[PDB]
């Protein structure tokens, strides 16, 4: 087609566009033993294929995932604040319970077939399957402990609410601007805040013993 | 069918014998008239002919093929509407075979097609050649001259201008002539070798006249104002300081040396559409347009820099210091009225001046990106409104006037920044008025509200109802939100005794909140600091220069007509037989370019 | 991390797109299935994806085609 | 008086100084005082012509006849 600076080319998608056993797209995306995916996911056919899959269905599926998790988190917050200290309250609690079971089986399946070398980097998406699973497990465990006569259900409920609001960071890393912001925040925290907190706990305990004695 | 066969034989070009035999067959079928021949010689879906498809597919045997096609078209008295045919599709409408011959860098076939009678004013008036925005389509100027000059083909530009029927002053759909189009296509210095400057100069000299440069497109912009609107710093630097030394085209220059003796040289620059005496000059457009992010380099051009310096040193320094003094005494009177508030005759000097600002900035807002330039308009207006509201509430029996009066005093002392921005001590404020303005802080505010609300619920939930100070300041949700806010405001206190069944979980969440808010604060800190102190000093100096130019023009807009005519930078100078154009004189000294001085207006320097 | 942000966003985006595409039913995938058939040779008929790229830093000339008539 | 710098003149005034001083090989040009009493060397000191002053203050003529015009004698 090319006329000036414009050029309409026709790329081939025979063993590339995710309609075969293992295409170049699926291999390039899922292989975590190279650390060159950032450079390979920018080649013209793969790049445009991912863009068009996004635009066609994955933008909407991602927004629906985010909305469902957001409303599940809001209902979890509401049942944590309005805890007993059953008309519609139990309806919302059953919502959060069945959705916690769904999230738990989903992320547990994802964890089972989660190969190592995915967890090579802390700022990697593979890690989220673990926190989503832990939060869903905490929700169903809190419902289990609440059906019985235990008092420690509130600790699990509040922890599950806090971890869900933390897990919203997975979705803010899916939008574009919020991606840069959230990755900067999570980098700061997981890399520098934890190292500084280790050495600072050393300082705290040492000087606390020194000034207490 | 024969149409697809002719198109394939003309695109593949492996041999002209195939198309020769197919054209024999076509003539045979035609002998059994013009509309049929071309309806079978064009593609009804786009309107493309065999000639375009032959030139769109250049092969080592394409000149002979276009010769065969044109011979067959002329041997049937149809070549008129065949070589001048154009697309019909909405995207590439108007594109003819000469556009394709020039866009393929085929000069010989282009000369062939112009000699055969292809009209050289064919406007490619399509949605591909007139894109809504760049990077989606190819805008060159919608004309074979503009296409030959934009693709760097000076041979074809000479071939097109030496022609007789060419319209150099032809204006495309966007209103642009050849020079506006060259301005739009031009990008930079070494990005594409800066040939557009060469084409601009060549096309302007060939048609030596001021009509190409004084022609306004559909946005009422000339090529000079169009280089000012966009950030074409190189084309603007060329047009502004343009010295032609040919004896016949000397009147085309915009800069005239008249004075050189040795290294010393006093030059004149032209200030016709440049010195803010007209509708919107290069000066106005260069200063006020906030859509280029290149004013740092365009306000330092040859006439503009000295024009700004002259306006400043002539009246804007005095007006700026006088307004700073007036606002300073306004703020001192406001401070003394706020300190000696009646819990003393000049308490009205404030009010009047307030209303003045209240209207001035007020009108200044009524006449209109708009948070970096016009910010101070809004803050001065808000301050004046607060003052007049404080007065209205004070003369009424309201004891809520003190809040507005103290807020107005404080906001006026804050507005004192507008006058002190290039002082190296109010630098960080004058720079974070732009970066913190819109997006850097709203992300922080959203994340902080999420933290506050989530942790307020998480901590209020953990607390047990108790018999009525409740032993816990984290009681209802609002009390937990208040305690958390006071914490991030360093107004709080951490107690491990909050009347909770899970005190260790409560403490964990409290410390988590503390650390997360500290992380957010540190993000905003390193954002608004962003030191790279060399570059942040570049940024502060650049902001000071830009606001200095802006306020110079604001102050020139305030004077009456007679005072403006009395300042009126620019000496009237005769530069040609009878030209007499207002210029601006700039003396310089250069010890490197040693040349005999043959271009000058005065032979006796001084 | 300025760019590392874009790296991590691109990787998570690709992984999310691919798992979502796997979640769909086979008929839905068949419905979306970007890419259209195109005859390349005598009998080639491969699924091609048309990408129009405008590079405004172009200095060259193009003369080739499959359907010279711009689409 | 005319010498400016190296970034603006490319150091031809030093060469012209050397040429005009050698061709007229005599101390009459360097020992002359203007209407301020300043010799060329004291004038280069007064107006901070650092390149001209560096040239004059360390000027070595290796020719056998014009060596009395030297100010630095590497021996
Ligand atoms: C050169 O600065 C000064 N010199 C001497 N005295 C002064 O005040 C007595 C001042 C001064 O800046 N005063 C101010 N007044 C106000 C007003 F809110 F009232 F408008 C200020 C303001 C406005 C908006 N956001 C903030 C932040 C984000 C910082 C918060 N929180 C502060 S700042
Ligand atoms: C968008 O974030 C939120 N929005 C609204 N509400 C929220 O919580 C109510 C939140 C939120 O971040 N919650 C969290 N939960 C937990 C968990 F420990 F339970 F895992 C957090 C955690 C995990 C690991 N290390 C820390 C540090 C290093 C900081 C310490 N110390 C904190 S953080
Ligand atoms: C547990 O404490 C926290 N946890 C999480 N995040 C936090 O801040 C993000 C905080 C916190 O202490 N914040 C603060 N805010 C402010 C304020 F400027 F508003 F006054 C603070 C303050 C108050 C008084 N004198 C200063 C000096 C003069 C020393 C300075 N500078 C600073 S302290």
XYZ file of N, CA, C and O in Angstrom, chain A residues 54-189:
544
model
N -7.385 -6.709 23.219
C -7.815 -5.777 24.251
C -9.076 -5.051 23.817
O -10.152 -5.296 24.368
N -8.963 -4.251 22.749
C -10.081 -3.442 22.264
C -11.339 -4.269 22.036
O -12.450 -3.800 22.299
N -11.190 -5.496 21.539
C -12.365 -6.275 21.177
C -13.083 -6.820 22.404
O -14.289 -6.610 22.559
N -12.377 -7.528 23.287
C -13.062 -8.128 24.430
C -12.372 -7.941 25.771
O -13.059 -7.983 26.803
N -11.067 -7.700 25.807
C -10.374 -7.843 27.077
C -10.464 -6.579 27.911
O -10.430 -6.655 29.138
N -10.622 -5.421 27.271
C -10.919 -4.201 28.011
C -12.206 -4.356 28.808
O -12.261 -4.031 30.000
N -13.249 -4.884 28.166
C -14.530 -5.052 28.840
C -14.458 -6.134 29.906
O -15.016 -5.972 30.997
N -13.777 -7.245 29.617
C -13.665 -8.292 30.628
C -12.864 -7.810 31.833
O -13.186 -8.150 32.977
N -11.850 -6.974 31.604
C -11.064 -6.435 32.705
C -11.869 -5.443 33.525
O -11.782 -5.438 34.757
N -12.648 -4.586 32.864
C -13.473 -3.642 33.608
C -14.539 -4.365 34.420
O -14.857 -3.954 35.539
N -15.089 -5.456 33.887
C -16.068 -6.220 34.654
C -15.418 -6.931 35.832
O -16.000 -6.995 36.921
N -14.219 -7.482 35.635
C -13.470 -8.053 36.748
C -13.246 -7.018 37.843
O -13.483 -7.280 39.030
N -12.792 -5.825 37.451
C -12.543 -4.764 38.418
C -13.815 -4.360 39.141
O -13.801 -4.156 40.355
N -14.921 -4.214 38.409
C -16.173 -3.799 39.033
C -16.668 -4.842 40.022
O -17.123 -4.502 41.121
N -16.593 -6.120 39.652
C -17.027 -7.168 40.567
C -16.167 -7.194 41.820
O -16.689 -7.320 42.933
N -14.847 -7.051 41.670
C -13.995 -7.043 42.856
C -14.234 -5.799 43.699
O -14.201 -5.865 44.930
N -14.499 -4.662 43.057
C -14.770 -3.430 43.785
C -16.040 -3.542 44.615
O -16.063 -3.144 45.783
N -17.103 -4.100 44.039
C -18.342 -4.226 44.797
C -18.243 -5.318 45.850
O -18.836 -5.192 46.927
N -17.477 -6.375 45.581
C -17.226 -7.384 46.601
C -16.459 -6.788 47.774
O -16.760 -7.079 48.937
N -15.509 -5.899 47.489
C -14.762 -5.235 48.549
C -15.641 -4.267 49.322
O -15.510 -4.143 50.543
N -16.535 -3.562 48.632
C -17.429 -2.639 49.321
C -18.371 -3.396 50.248
O -18.591 -2.988 51.393
N -18.930 -4.513 49.786
C -19.802 -5.301 50.652
C -19.026 -5.912 51.812
O -19.543 -6.030 52.927
N -17.771 -6.298 51.574
C -16.943 -6.808 52.661
C -16.689 -5.728 53.707
O -16.749 -5.989 54.914
N -16.416 -4.505 53.255
C -16.271 -3.375 54.166
C -17.549 -3.142 54.961
O -17.503 -2.902 56.172
N -18.701 -3.217 54.292
C -19.972 -2.951 54.958
C -20.293 -4.012 56.001
O -20.840 -3.698 57.062
N -19.973 -5.278 55.721
C -20.235 -6.314 56.713
C -19.157 -6.346 57.783
O -19.363 -6.945 58.844
N -18.005 -5.722 57.539
C -17.014 -5.586 58.599
C -17.375 -4.456 59.555
O -17.220 -4.597 60.772
N -17.866 -3.333 59.029
C -18.225 -2.212 59.891
C -19.497 -2.501 60.677
O -19.557 -2.264 61.888
N -20.527 -3.016 60.004
C -21.826 -3.270 60.615
C -21.907 -4.644 61.260
O -22.999 -5.217 61.355
N -20.771 -5.189 61.693
C -20.728 -6.500 62.311
C -21.626 -6.549 63.543
O -21.967 -5.513 64.118
N -22.027 -7.750 63.968
C -22.773 -7.890 65.235
C -21.877 -7.678 66.454
O -20.880 -8.360 66.684
N -22.240 -6.694 67.266
C -21.483 -6.394 68.474
C -22.410 -6.170 69.662
O -22.636 -7.078 70.462
N -30.334 -9.559 59.954
C -30.251 -10.706 59.069
C -31.233 -10.653 57.915
O -31.455 -11.652 57.232
N -31.824 -9.478 57.693
C -32.774 -9.275 56.605
C -32.063 -9.112 55.266
O -32.278 -9.902 54.342
N -31.218 -8.087 55.145
C -30.363 -7.913 53.979
C -28.885 -8.089 54.289
O -28.100 -8.301 53.361
N -28.493 -7.996 55.563
C -27.099 -8.211 55.937
C -26.622 -9.592 55.510
O -25.545 -9.736 54.919
N -27.411 -10.624 55.804
C -27.029 -11.981 55.440
C -27.038 -12.207 53.936
O -26.268 -13.038 53.451
N -27.861 -11.472 53.187
C -27.782 -11.523 51.731
C -26.415 -11.051 51.246
O -25.783 -11.695 50.400
N -25.937 -9.928 51.786
C -24.615 -9.450 51.417
C -23.506 -10.374 51.882
O -22.511 -10.568 51.178
N -23.658 -10.959 53.072
C -22.651 -11.902 53.544
C -22.611 -13.151 52.672
O -21.538 -13.709 52.428
N -23.762 -13.594 52.167
C -23.758 -14.747 51.275
C -23.194 -14.380 49.911
O -22.536 -15.204 49.262
N -23.424 -13.143 49.464
C -22.724 -12.650 48.283
C -21.217 -12.773 48.462
O -20.530 -13.382 47.633
N -20.685 -12.190 49.539
C -19.240 -12.220 49.727
C -18.742 -13.641 49.941
O -17.628 -13.959 49.526
N -19.556 -14.532 50.509
C -19.096 -15.900 50.722
C -19.015 -16.680 49.416
O -18.003 -17.340 49.148
N -20.056 -16.615 48.585
C -20.009 -17.347 47.324
C -18.963 -16.740 46.397
O -18.274 -17.460 45.664
N -18.781 -15.416 46.448
C -17.769 -14.811 45.595
C -16.367 -15.080 46.122
O -15.423 -15.176 45.333
N -16.214 -15.253 47.435
C -14.930 -15.671 47.974
C -14.608 -17.096 47.561
O -13.463 -17.400 47.227
N -15.605 -17.983 47.566
C -15.372 -19.343 47.084
C -14.993 -19.348 45.606
O -14.081 -20.076 45.194
N -15.682 -18.542 44.795
C -15.355 -18.458 43.373
C -13.939 -17.931 43.158
O -13.157 -18.508 42.393
N -13.597 -16.821 43.817
C -12.249 -16.272 43.710
C -11.222 -17.285 44.194
O -10.140 -17.418 43.613
N -11.548 -18.029 45.249
C -10.580 -18.957 45.810
C -10.312 -20.105 44.855
O -9.154 -20.455 44.621
N -11.360 -20.683 44.262
C -11.127 -21.773 43.320
C -10.404 -21.259 42.079
O -9.495 -21.919 41.565
N -10.764 -20.064 41.599
C -10.097 -19.509 40.423
C -8.607 -19.305 40.675
O -7.763 -19.817 39.929
N -8.260 -18.552 41.721
C -6.855 -18.289 42.002
C -6.109 -19.531 42.471
O -4.897 -19.609 42.275
N -6.796 -20.529 43.023
C -6.129 -21.756 43.401
C -5.792 -22.600 42.194
O -4.728 -23.221 42.139
N -6.701 -22.632 41.218
C -6.390 -23.248 39.933
C -5.212 -22.536 39.284
O -4.271 -23.173 38.799
N -5.240 -21.200 39.278
C -4.133 -20.440 38.709
C -2.823 -20.696 39.447
O -1.752 -20.650 38.836
N -2.887 -20.964 40.752
C -1.678 -21.246 41.518
C -1.169 -22.654 41.241
O 0.046 -22.880 41.197
N -2.074 -23.614 41.048
C -1.657 -24.990 40.793
C -0.822 -25.082 39.523
O 0.278 -25.644 39.532
N -1.324 -24.527 38.421
C -0.587 -24.495 37.166
C 0.326 -23.278 37.057
O 0.720 -22.904 35.947
N 0.673 -22.657 38.182
C 1.604 -21.529 38.199
C 3.011 -22.091 38.325
O 3.429 -22.521 39.402
N 3.744 -22.086 37.218
C 5.093 -22.612 37.208
C 6.049 -21.645 37.901
O 5.840 -20.430 37.883
N 7.110 -22.160 38.518
C 8.135 -21.269 39.067
C 8.812 -20.490 37.953
O 8.542 -20.696 36.768
N 9.683 -19.566 38.351
C 10.339 -18.572 37.503
C 9.334 -17.517 37.068
O 9.735 -16.502 36.486
N 8.043 -17.723 37.328
C 7.097 -16.622 37.302
C 7.296 -15.741 38.523
O 7.216 -14.517 38.426
N 7.544 -16.357 39.666
C 7.722 -15.613 40.896
C 9.129 -15.076 41.051
O 9.554 -14.754 42.149
N 9.858 -14.982 39.950
C 11.224 -14.480 40.003
C 11.306 -13.026 40.462
O 12.194 -12.658 41.223
N 10.374 -12.205 39.998
C 10.360 -10.792 40.347
C 9.187 -10.480 41.244
O 8.107 -11.015 41.064
N 9.417 -9.677 42.271
C 8.334 -9.305 43.167
C 7.248 -8.445 42.490
O 6.069 -8.605 42.773
N 7.653 -7.540 41.600
C 6.721 -6.659 40.898
C 6.077 -7.316 39.692
O 5.792 -6.672 38.704
N 5.864 -8.611 39.794
C 5.252 -9.438 38.769
C 3.796 -9.820 39.062
O 3.392 -9.991 40.200
N 2.999 -9.941 38.015
C 1.591 -10.264 38.173
C 1.313 -11.623 38.799
O 0.301 -11.797 39.452
N 2.190 -12.596 38.588
C 1.988 -13.927 39.161
C 1.760 -13.923 40.667
O 1.006 -14.736 41.176
N 2.417 -13.016 41.376
C 2.300 -12.881 42.820
C 0.891 -12.572 43.301
O 0.510 -12.985 44.376
N 0.126 -11.829 42.521
C -1.227 -11.475 42.904
C -2.157 -12.659 43.110
O -3.049 -12.575 43.930
N -2.011 -13.720 42.331
C -2.832 -14.917 42.515
C -2.791 -15.395 43.962
O -3.758 -15.936 44.474
N -1.654 -15.198 44.609
C -1.460 -15.585 45.998
C -2.235 -14.690 46.953
O -2.883 -15.196 47.871
N -2.202 -13.373 46.753
C -2.893 -12.489 47.685
C -4.402 -12.549 47.476
O -5.171 -12.488 48.441
N -4.857 -12.694 46.228
C -6.283 -12.882 45.989
C -6.777 -14.167 46.640
O -7.851 -14.192 47.256
N -5.987 -15.239 46.543
C -6.355 -16.499 47.169
C -6.363 -16.382 48.684
O -7.274 -16.885 49.344
N -5.349 -15.728 49.253
C -5.284 -15.563 50.703
C -6.473 -14.757 51.202
O -7.058 -15.069 52.244
N -6.874 -13.728 50.458
C -7.995 -12.911 50.903
C -9.312 -13.669 50.800
O -10.143 -13.605 51.714
N -9.524 -14.399 49.702
C -10.739 -15.201 49.589
C -10.786 -16.276 50.667
O -11.850 -16.557 51.237
N -9.634 -16.875 50.972
C -9.558 -17.875 52.028
C -9.882 -17.249 53.376
O -10.583 -17.848 54.196
N -9.389 -16.035 53.627
C -9.702 -15.360 54.881
C -11.188 -15.050 54.982
O -11.773 -15.148 56.063
N -11.825 -14.704 53.863
C -13.258 -14.421 53.900
C -14.045 -15.683 54.231
O -14.918 -15.680 55.108
N -13.757 -16.783 53.530
C -14.529 -17.997 53.786
C -14.216 -18.544 55.178
O -15.101 -19.078 55.856
N -12.981 -18.371 55.652
C -12.632 -18.807 56.998
C -13.331 -17.962 58.052
O -13.731 -18.476 59.101
N -13.501 -16.664 57.790
C -14.222 -15.817 58.730
C -15.699 -16.175 58.765
O -16.320 -16.157 59.832
N -16.278 -16.526 57.616
C -17.672 -16.967 57.625
C -17.808 -18.288 58.373
O -18.770 -18.500 59.124
N -16.841 -19.191 58.195
C -16.860 -20.452 58.928
C -16.766 -20.222 60.431
O -17.521 -20.820 61.205
N -15.849 -19.356 60.864
C -15.706 -19.062 62.284
C -16.870 -18.258 62.842
O -17.083 -18.267 64.059
N -17.622 -17.559 61.992
C -18.780 -16.818 62.476
C -19.998 -17.719 62.615
O -20.812 -17.525 63.525
N -20.154 -18.697 61.720
C -21.255 -19.641 61.872
C -21.142 -20.401 63.188
O -22.153 -20.682 63.841
N -19.922 -20.730 63.596
C -19.696 -21.346 64.891
C -19.614 -20.270 65.974
O -19.779 -19.074 65.719
N -19.362 -20.701 67.208
C -19.263 -19.783 68.340
C -17.796 -19.467 68.630
O -17.227 -19.852 69.652
N -17.184 -18.745 67.696
C -15.831 -18.241 67.864
C -15.839 -16.720 67.813
O -16.656 -16.102 67.127
N -14.914 -16.121 68.560
C -14.762 -14.673 68.585
C -13.731 -14.163 67.591
O -13.789 -12.989 67.213
N -12.804 -15.013 67.154
C -11.716 -14.606 66.274
C -12.140 -14.459 64.820
O -11.271 -14.342 63.952
N -13.441 -14.471 64.527
C -13.878 -14.243 63.156
C -13.655 -12.799 62.735
O -13.485 -12.521 61.542
N -13.637 -11.875 63.695
C -13.502 -10.463 63.361
C -12.098 -10.136 62.882
O -11.921 -9.294 61.996
N -11.085 -10.785 63.456
C -9.723 -10.580 62.979
C -9.599 -10.980 61.518
O -9.052 -10.230 60.701
N -10.122 -12.156 61.166
C -10.084 -12.600 59.779
C -10.907 -11.693 58.876
O -10.495 -11.414 57.750
N -12.051 -11.207 59.355
C -12.886 -10.340 58.530
C -12.188 -9.018 58.233
O -12.175 -8.550 57.086
N -11.583 -8.409 59.252
C -10.912 -7.129 59.059
C -9.655 -7.306 58.218
O -9.345 -6.472 57.356
N -8.926 -8.406 58.426
C -7.765 -8.687 57.592
C -8.167 -8.895 56.140
O -7.470 -8.445 55.227
N -9.289 -9.576 55.908
C -9.753 -9.804 54.547
C -10.162 -8.503 53.878
O -9.873 -8.289 52.697
N -10.824 -7.613 54.616
C -11.177 -6.314 54.052
C -9.927 -5.511 53.697
O -9.826 -4.936 52.602
N -8.952 -5.478 54.610
C -7.726 -4.728 54.354
C -6.962 -5.304 53.169
O -6.459 -4.557 52.319
N -6.887 -6.631 53.078
C -6.169 -7.249 51.975
C -6.900 -7.071 50.656
O -6.257 -6.969 49.616
N -8.233 -7.022 50.665
C -8.944 -6.735 49.432
C -8.683 -5.329 48.935
O -8.462 -5.104 47.735
N -8.695 -4.360 49.846
C -8.402 -3.001 49.416
C -6.959 -2.863 48.964
O -6.663 -2.042 48.092
N -6.050 -3.658 49.529
C -4.695 -3.701 48.992
C -4.671 -4.323 47.601
O -3.962 -3.842 46.712
N -5.447 -5.390 47.394
C -5.448 -6.116 46.131
C -6.032 -5.306 44.988
O -5.792 -5.645 43.827
N -6.815 -4.270 45.285
C -7.218 -3.345 44.223
C -6.022 -2.780 43.456
O -6.193 -2.259 42.344
N -4.818 -2.880 44.020
C -3.614 -2.441 43.324
C -3.372 -3.250 42.057
O -2.756 -2.750 41.111
N -3.846 -4.497 42.018
C -3.736 -5.292 40.800
C -4.507 -4.653 39.658
O -4.048 -4.649 38.511
N -5.685 -4.108 39.953
C -6.491 -3.480 38.918
C -5.976 -2.094 38.574
O -6.005 -1.699 37.406
N -5.491 -1.341 39.563
C -4.904 -0.049 39.224
C -3.624 -0.190 38.412
O -3.217 0.769 37.754
N -2.986 -1.358 38.430
C -1.874 -1.633 37.530
C -2.334 -2.060 36.147
O -1.495 -2.435 35.321
N -3.637 -2.027 35.876
C -4.163 -2.436 34.591
C -4.574 -1.254 33.745
O -4.508 -1.310 32.514
N -5.005 -0.177 34.394
C -5.148 1.101 33.719
C -3.757 1.638 33.402
O -2.751 1.114 33.871
N -3.678 2.686 32.585
C -2.390 3.107 32.040
C -1.646 4.095 32.939
O -0.487 3.859 33.287
N -2.270 5.219 33.287
C -1.685 6.175 34.227
C -1.495 5.556 35.608
O -0.400 5.581 36.203
N -2.598 5.022 36.132
C -2.551 4.344 37.413
C -1.552 3.201 37.390
O -1.061 2.798 38.443
N -1.200 2.695 36.205
C -0.144 1.691 36.134
C 1.174 2.260 36.625
O 1.802 1.697 37.523
N 1.616 3.375 36.043
C 2.879 3.964 36.469
C 2.829 4.342 37.942
O 3.762 4.051 38.701
N 1.721 4.950 38.375
C 1.627 5.353 39.777
C 1.706 4.149 40.715
O 2.483 4.144 41.679
N 0.908 3.114 40.442
C 0.820 1.964 41.328
C 2.100 1.146 41.317
O 2.506 0.618 42.355
N 2.746 1.010 40.158
C 4.019 0.299 40.132
C 5.082 1.071 40.894
O 5.900 0.468 41.594
N 5.093 2.404 40.802
C 6.038 3.169 41.608
C 5.785 2.953 43.096
O 6.722 2.717 43.871
N 4.516 3.017 43.509
C 4.173 2.817 44.916
C 4.614 1.435 45.381
O 5.247 1.282 46.433
N 4.286 0.407 44.598
C 4.553 -0.963 45.015
C 6.044 -1.264 44.992
O 6.539 -2.030 45.825
N 6.781 -0.658 44.059
C 8.233 -0.765 44.073
C 8.792 -0.186 45.353
O 9.513 -0.867 46.094
N 8.461 1.080 45.631
C 8.907 1.721 46.864
C 8.658 0.798 48.045
O 9.595 0.389 48.741
N 7.404 0.384 48.232
C 7.058 -0.437 49.386
C 7.889 -1.712 49.400
O 8.835 -1.819 50.186
